Amino acid sequence: VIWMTQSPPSLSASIGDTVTITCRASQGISNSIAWYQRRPGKAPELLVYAAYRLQSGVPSRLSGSGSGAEYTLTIKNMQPEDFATYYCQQYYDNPLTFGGGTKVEIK
Amino acid sequence: QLSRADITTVSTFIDLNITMLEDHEFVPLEVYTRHEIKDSGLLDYTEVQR
Amino acid sequence: QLSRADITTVSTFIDLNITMLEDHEFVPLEVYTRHEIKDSGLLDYTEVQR
Amino acid sequence: ANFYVCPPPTGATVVQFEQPRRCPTRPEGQNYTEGIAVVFKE
Amino acid sequence: VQLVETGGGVVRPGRSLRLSCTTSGFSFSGSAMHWVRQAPGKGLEWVAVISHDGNIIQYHDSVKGRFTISRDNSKNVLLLQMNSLRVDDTAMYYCARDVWLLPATISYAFDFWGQGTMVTVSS
Amino acid sequence: DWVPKRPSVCTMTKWQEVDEMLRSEYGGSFRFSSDAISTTFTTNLTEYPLSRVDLGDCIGKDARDAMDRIFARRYNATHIKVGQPQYYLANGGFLIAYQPLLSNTVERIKTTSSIEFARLQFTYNHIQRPVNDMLGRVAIAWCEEQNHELTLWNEARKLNPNAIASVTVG
Amino acid sequence: LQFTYNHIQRPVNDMLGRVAIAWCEEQNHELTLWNEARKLNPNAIASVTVG
Ligand SMILES: *[C@@H]1O[C@H](CO)[C@@H](O[C@@H]2O[C@H](CO)[C@@H](O[C@@H]3O[C@H](CO[C@H]4O[C@H](CO[C@H]5O[C@H](CO)[C@@H](O)[C@H](O)[C@@H]5O)[C@@H](O)[C@H](O[C@H]5O[C@H](CO)[C@@H](O)[C@H](O)[C@@H]5O)[C@@H]4O)[C@@H](O)[C@H](O[C@H]4O[C@H](CO)[C@@H](O)[C@H](O)[C@@H]4O)[C@@H]3O)[C@H](O)[C@H]2NC(C)=O)[C@H](O)[C@H]1NC(C)=O
Ligand SMILES: *[C@@H]1O[C@H](CO)[C@@H](O[C@@H]2O[C@H](CO)[C@@H](O)[C@H](O)[C@H]2NC(C)=O)[C@H](O)[C@H]1NC(C)=O
Ligand SMILES: *[C@@H]1O[C@H](CO)[C@@H](O)[C@H](O)[C@H]1NC(C)=O
Ligand SMILES: *[C@@H]1O[C@H](CO)[C@@H](O)[C@H](O)[C@H]1NC(C)=O
Ligand SMILES: *[C@@H]1O[C@H](CO)[C@@H](O)[C@H](O)[C@H]1NC(C)=O
């Protein structure tokens, strides 16, 4: 099992600033990793795939990066609809494991 | 009024028949497998010693 | 006086595109080299006797 | 089938044919050089 | 697109329960399906996966041999027959479709998620 | 020195590391053709269960190690990994560990002692596929040309129906 | 295999090159007929050529 360490578990940001969420795996997974977003009271929705492929309709201002066992998700311009829980999941080897989750909130 | 096929028709085109090359599947084939070559020896030091 | 390209042009020819076969280079390839086949034996009379 | 009503044309729209295209050059033949050879193996 | 799940409820430990997930808005026969659970106040965890045609099945080590995933392309409905439940299985089960990137491959990622249903194991 | 068996012995050895392995389906079977080594392998479209290979733990490790190194070396800046690796049992006794890519734009396997059967498949396919493509264009062009000549024969007949009818009638 | 592929590619390409050259020479030859056929009936000639 590939454990997924996600940090910071919780941080606050203002509307119109930059944020960076780091996700780390227990072993090198090349680029097999996905990012999700779950707003309060709704089901999760995919954002990025393979750490670089942005999903259709996702804002261009949101992007991910990294390699090996280190990955990060960044947003250059936060919007009121971006404050939500973000999870990082890997698919390099089974079983699929999710990250601890990081809740971005208003500061 | 008469149909179009009621009058004799002559082909004014110079027909050229083109038959594409049919797909071919190659199966493995060996005159003597590696096992047969090994068995060709009258005696085997490995089996004799064992 | 007007240039030749000022009037719309229609191709009266029936284009036929011909793509020559690209050159291919074949590299050596063996499933098991003669050294590997020799090493497949558990014991070698030559080395054991030596 | 469909009939067609063609009004007389005028100089508003003009079309021309394409000029003869230069044909491709003949493919270059192989540059072989005859010679005797002996292949050696390990 | 819309995903609906039915079959949730309260069940005693060691008993069997069968869930169902209806789909609409996408070619069910041309996309794999996955099952995800969300325990109360915990993180997400994958459950199983069923290919587009159901030829290959993969499970999680915590549910291997206990659960049973299946699908019916004719009725475009996904099912997950659960047996030998445990207290640790209490979680919100979600049915999600894979990310369609190629014709017959499994992306092992989630693009569409359902509303989810509760499955509480209590005695 | 003592060591565990499963992680020390294998029944399959990594033979070749192909950077470009094109997979196509025709005639009810997948065909993995490699342009680098000039080889074509045929399978049954069903992923061979890796658990069926006796002592084959080194195959998930070796296959993934080569895929990660090859992907980062050449496919990181232009392609994306799609799904997990897929293992297919090819004709002749060759196990192919495949990793699909997308553009941004218990028993023992008996391997044959000669891959020349597969090389001929690639050579024939490399010569049949294009020749047929050029046989198909010539046929299409000929038909388009013949339909083009009709516009001239419809007018040439009025100038001299005797000569036009003679050649056309036979 | 290298010789076999070369023995089949070299000639086939030579015959693919002659056909292409002959086609171009033929098309340029037809223009001499279309330039005159248009005067006989510009309606039919323009229809097929214009599309
Ligand atoms: C031979 O090779 C070909 C490759 O050339 C191979 O695959 C065929 O390739 C074509 C072209 O790519 C395929 O057509 C595409 O298939 C997609 C179908 O979408 C599925 O998923 C939809 C939802 O997910 C997609 O979209 C979301 C965003 O909306 C995105 O986040 C996801 O990641 C994912 O990409 C889902 O809606 C859809 O179901 C709808 O559509 C189908 C018809 O397509 C209909 O039956 C359903 O009822 C429903 O309405 C489906 O489940 C899709 O990406 C793509 O869409 C583009 O094109 C269409 C026009 O065709 C546009 O309208 C649209 O906006 C997009 O631009 C497109 O349809 C085709 O499906 C493949 N064929 C097969 C059989 O799989 C062949 O398979 C190969 N053959 C062999 C024998 O191997
Ligand atoms: C691919 O599948 C075919 C069937 O589709 C397999 O054919 C079997 O071959 C064995 C050989 O001993 C026969 O006993 C079986 O009767 C065949 N099955 C059928 C349904 O005809 C074939 O072996 C498979 N090939 C590979 C490489 O796995
Ligand atoms: C094939 O070509 C010949 C002329 O060579 C023609 O008579 C025939 O109709 C064509 N088609 C078939 C189906 O034979
Ligand atoms: C190739 O042939 C097509 C017709 O099949 C033609 O339209 C095209 O211009 C030709 N040349 C190129 C460079 O595509
Ligand atoms: C892969 O490419 C991305 C850009 O697509 C780049 O940021 C990254 O550093 C590359 N990774 C490696 C390991 O070369």
Author numbering:
A (entry chain L): 1 to 107
B (entry chain B), C (entry chain C): 658 to 707
D (entry chain B): 111 to 152
E (entry chain H): 2 to 52, 52A, 53 to 82, 82A, 82B, 82C, 83 to 100, 100A, ...
F (entry chain A): 355 to 459, 492 to 556
G (entry chain B): 506 to 556
Sentences reproduced from the published study:
We also analysed antibody D48, which has been shown to recognize gB and prevent entry. We determined structures by single-particle cryo-EM of D48 Fab in complex with each of the three versions of stabilized HSV-1 gB that we had designed. With the complex of D48 Fab with gB-Ecto.H516P.L531E (3.8-Å resolution), D48 Fab induced the postfusion conformation (middle). The fact that D48 induced the postfusion conformation in gB-Ecto.H516P.L531E (which in the absence of D48 exclusively assumed a prefusion conformation) suggested that D48 functions by prematurely inducing the postfusion conformation of gB. Examination of D48 Fab–gB-Ecto.H516P and D48 Fab–gB-Ecto.H516P.L531E structures revealed D48 to straddle the 432–440 loop connecting the α2 helix and β21 strand, with recognition of N-linked glycans N141 and N430 contributing 42% of the interactive surface. The orientation of glycan N141 enforced by D48 binding would sterically clash with the prefusion-specific configuration of the C-terminal DII helix (residues 460–474). Here we provide the molecular basis for the neutralization mechanism of antibody D48 through pre-triggering of the postfusion state (a type of neutralization observed with the severe acute respiratory syndrome coronavirus neutralizing antibody S230).
